[PDB]
Design a protein around this nucleic acid. Structure first.
Lengths: 132, 100, 378, 63
RNA sequence: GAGACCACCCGGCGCGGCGCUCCUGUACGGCGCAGAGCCCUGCGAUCGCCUGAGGGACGCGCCUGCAGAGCGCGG
RNA sequence: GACCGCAGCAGGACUCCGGGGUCAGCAGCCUCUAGCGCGGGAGCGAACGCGGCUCAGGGAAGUCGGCAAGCCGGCUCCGUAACCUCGGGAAAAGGAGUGGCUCUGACGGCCCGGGUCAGAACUGGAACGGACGCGGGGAUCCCGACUGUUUACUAGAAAC
């Protein structure tokens, strides 16, 4: 929803990001990023607020694993620069499983969630406890 | 005519490999006296050599004060540089002790 | 065969040949379109890059997420010691192309401009415009020559000299630029306007206005002989490769039998004339004003000078122009600023909430010496 | 201008300078410099580094 | 500010001082009824004060000191 | 330091005597004695090489293959699985401690010796095998039981 200002992409493909929702998945492996055109040799990259195609890790509930699932990264360890000049980074890299339509697969989003993720996806914004 | 000048050897080895610091420092002392002396011949007392090598070939003192006399005759005027040990290198600048 | 996977060329062939700029300073080359209907305006002005800074800004860009929101941007201060006009050059439009039709020099040429003429002023004989000063002085000769320009010239230019005494650098010799005069109803009016500016100072405030966008021209920062990986952008090859990985691997096919000019080769990177474009003029002011860069929110006098001085540049005593972002060149390098040839249509309006006078030497937290003194107090 | 202080150093971060960390406790930790941040990430105590206002408070030099 | 060498750009330069600003993190030493304790006025890792100290700087501003523009070569 | 390889050839030559400190050490790392300054020097501090470091966030997605590098490691103390020819596996895995000072116990001989092992306090930017030395680990599959040996100089193997 809206237009996303470019933010530094800290999570390449092959990254494992934590789950911030009570879906029953603990670790999400980034298979790919939505809306990526490629250049020869360039792995797909992703940042806060970007939909990523993930697969649930073996630690996750059996129903969730063995299938590609869409999710949005909400926390990124790499620091990024907002237009106002704020440089912000998070303690961990985390994601919430969400359908491309925007339905969250989880009742609650635990922990802090980035402002950019919250503006782009409306359901994440209501659910998130804090938008720091 | 006894010139009294300080030289920062730390500034001399800036740009050169640490292993050859003290030899580079000695050359700088000859060259920087030549600019002050205005005569080419510079002879450094062995005391100047001991001071530059007090802390090894890599960590020459940051500053040294030298009292240089221009005694010479028959056109071969030479400068004899000695080492003056100073507690403070604070307000220290050229201090020529008279002339002739 | 074929590249198999499609990948673009690395580098712009337009920017070849990549040689150190032989021209001394960035040249204006082409000048803005005349228009033929505006208040007569000079189109360019030389500057010395002073430094870069942070500017808090309020954005009025409708349709953008930044609308009604604050932003911080890189600014680039270009020191602008006031220039003085020393001559007027007229150019006929000939079939071959614009060709000069004689220049009329000032009756009195300043020592900085004369210093440019010689390699060593002290050892030179100062024999410049010696018989010219006698031919003029009365000034009847100057008017007669100006009249020849009025009939034989279609493009009028003003020669101008920077005074480097009022700039922190050690250039001492002046820099001469032909600044074009544009917009007047007719060539006779243009040379009349030029005579009024002759032997008198020109300031950036007159040439460029806040909110306009200018094109900055200068020689780039020089890196010396660089490798293909840094110079053209190629990949560092696998680290299991003998004879090095910092080299383009294959520089051509069997045929053509010769290396093509397209292929990336190692050479000089840097010191290249480059023109940047449409950098908005955030603020034109003089450092003499104590409150020159003050804004309502800081409540401090806030002159342009950072605490501790600009880094690798000095006093910036006189007027300055601040441009959005960056301009080509290192600090202490001449940069020709020229009115934009193709300005960006949807540029926001510039309203600066805050400017940073915090020391750029190191990391600064105090924006005034008094402010740092107050913190350390005892 | 609007100003924030380091969560560790307690010196006013000037606008456009500094890095903000969002901790898992949902607490923003604003840091003036990389040094302000590195001391916190090594959990080195704020009250044993003298330049910090916390140690200035403990000495009672600045409180 | 430019560089393999050259060239380029600038020139009475530079050296080493002094302020300013910044980096690190509170200098030696002296003082204490600090100090776990031990033992004789002795010992002691440390801690507090003099001290956001001292030390350093290749960025700035200045000279306050020495200096610094070849009848060198060519035209 | 003169032998032998065409050389004043980072090539190869058998013995004997072997100090101090840190240490389990004849290890590494500095040193006493004794030797000694090696087919030359100056500058500059490009590319590129050759050795060496560091790198945000991710982490093998790189590659024929995790090649190379990185991790691990000393000591003490817990805690150790399947499997097994019952010997092993096993240092499995997986952890916790470690510095300096100030003490307090143990241990002999007949007031005199050892300096190792425990147990405390107290202190330090949230540090201690602070250099150095010094396994990454697990789950399998195929061959060959094993320690051995092998194409001087492109195969060290499942071959002998």
């Amino acid at each position: 929803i809206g237009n996303k200002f470019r933010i530094s992409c800290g999570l390449p493909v092959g990254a494992v990001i934590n789950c911030a929702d009570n879906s029953g998945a603990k670790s999400l492996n980034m298979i790919a990023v939505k809306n990526w055109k490629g250049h020869l040799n360039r792995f797909p990259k992703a940042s806060v607020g970007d939909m990523v195609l993930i697969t649930v890790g073996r630690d996750g509930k059996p129903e969730l694993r063995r299938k590609v699932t869409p999710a949005v990264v909400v926390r990124q360890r790499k620091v990024w620069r907002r237009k106002d000049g704020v440089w912000i980074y998070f303690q961990d890299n985390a994601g919430v499983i969400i359908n491309p339509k925007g339905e969250l697969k989880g009742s609650s989003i635990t922990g802090p969630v980035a402002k950019e993720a919250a503006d782009r996806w409306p359901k994440i914004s209501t659910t998130a406890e804090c938008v720091h | 005519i006894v010139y009294e000048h300080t030289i920062r050897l730390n500034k001399a080895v800036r740009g050169k490999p640490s292993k050859k610091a003290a030899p580079i420092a000695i050359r700088a002392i000859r060259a920087q006296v030549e600019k002050l002396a205005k005569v080419e011949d510079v002879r450094l007392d062995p005391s100047v050599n001991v001071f530059v090598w007090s802390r090894g070939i890599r960590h020459v003192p940051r500053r040294i004060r030298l009292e240089v006399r221009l005694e010479g005759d028959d056109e071969h005027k030479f400068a004899y540089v000695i080492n003056k040990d100073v507690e403070n290198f604070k307000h220290l600048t050229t201090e020529k002790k008279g002339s002739e | 065969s074929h590249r198999k996977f499609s990948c673009c060329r690395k580098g712009n062939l337009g920017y070849l040949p990549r040689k150190r700029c032989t021209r001394g300073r960035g040249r204006c080359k082409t000048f803005p379109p005349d228009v033929q209907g505006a208040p007569i305006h000079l189109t360019a002005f030389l500057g010395y890059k002073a430094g870069c800074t942070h500017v808090m800004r309020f954005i009025d860009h409708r349709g953008s997420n930044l609308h009604n929101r604050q932003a911080i941007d890189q600014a680039t201060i270009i020191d602008a010691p006031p220039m003085i006009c020393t001559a007027i050059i007229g150019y006929a439009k000939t079939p071959k192309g614009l060709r000069a039709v004689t220049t009329v020099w000032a009756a009195h040429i300043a020592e900085p401009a004369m210093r440019r003429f010689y390699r060593n002023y002290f050892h030179a004989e100062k024999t410049a415009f010696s018989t010219y000063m006698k031919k003029a002085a009365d000034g009847t000769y100057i008017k007669e020559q100006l009249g020849r320009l009025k009939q034989h010239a279609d493009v009028i230019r003003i020669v101008a000299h920077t005074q480097p005494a009022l700039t922190p650098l050690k250039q001492k010799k002046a820099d001469i630029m032909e600044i074009q005069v544009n917009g007047g109803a007719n060539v006779a009016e243009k040379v009349d306007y030029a005579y009024a500016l002759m032997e008198k100072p020109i300031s950036i405030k007159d040439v460029f206005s806040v909110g306009a966008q200018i094109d900055t021209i200068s020689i780039t920062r020089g890196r010396g002989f660089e490798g293909v990986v840094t110079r053209w952008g190629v990949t560092r090859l696998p680290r299991k490769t003998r004879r090095g990985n910092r080299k383009v691997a294959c520089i051509g096919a069997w045929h053509p039998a010769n290396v093509q000019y397209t292929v990336a080769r190692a050479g000089q990177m840097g010191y290249f004339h480059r023109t940047d474009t449409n950098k908005q003029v955030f603020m034109i002011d003089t450092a003499e004003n104590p409150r020159c860069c003050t804004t309502e929110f800081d409540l401090t006098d806030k002159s342009i000078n950072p605490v501790g001085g600009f880094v690798n540049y000095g006093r910036v005593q006189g007027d300055f122009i601040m441009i959005k972002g960056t301009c080509p060149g290192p600090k202490r390098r001449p940069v020709v600023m020229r009115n934009a040839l193709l300005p960006h249509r949807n540029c926001p309006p510039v309203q600066l909430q805050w400017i940073s006078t915090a020391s750029k030497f190191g990391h600064g937290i105090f924006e005034t010496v008094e402010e740092r003194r107050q913190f350390y107090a005892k | 201008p609007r100003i924030e202080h380091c969560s560790f150093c307690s010196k006013p971060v000037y606008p456009g300078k500094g890095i903000c960390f969002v901790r898992n406790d949902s607490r923003v930790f604003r840091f003036c410099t990389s040094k302000c941040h590195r001391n916190f990430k090594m959990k080195r105590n704020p009250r044993k580094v003298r330049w910090t206002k916390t140690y200035r408070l403990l000495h009672n030099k600045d409180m």
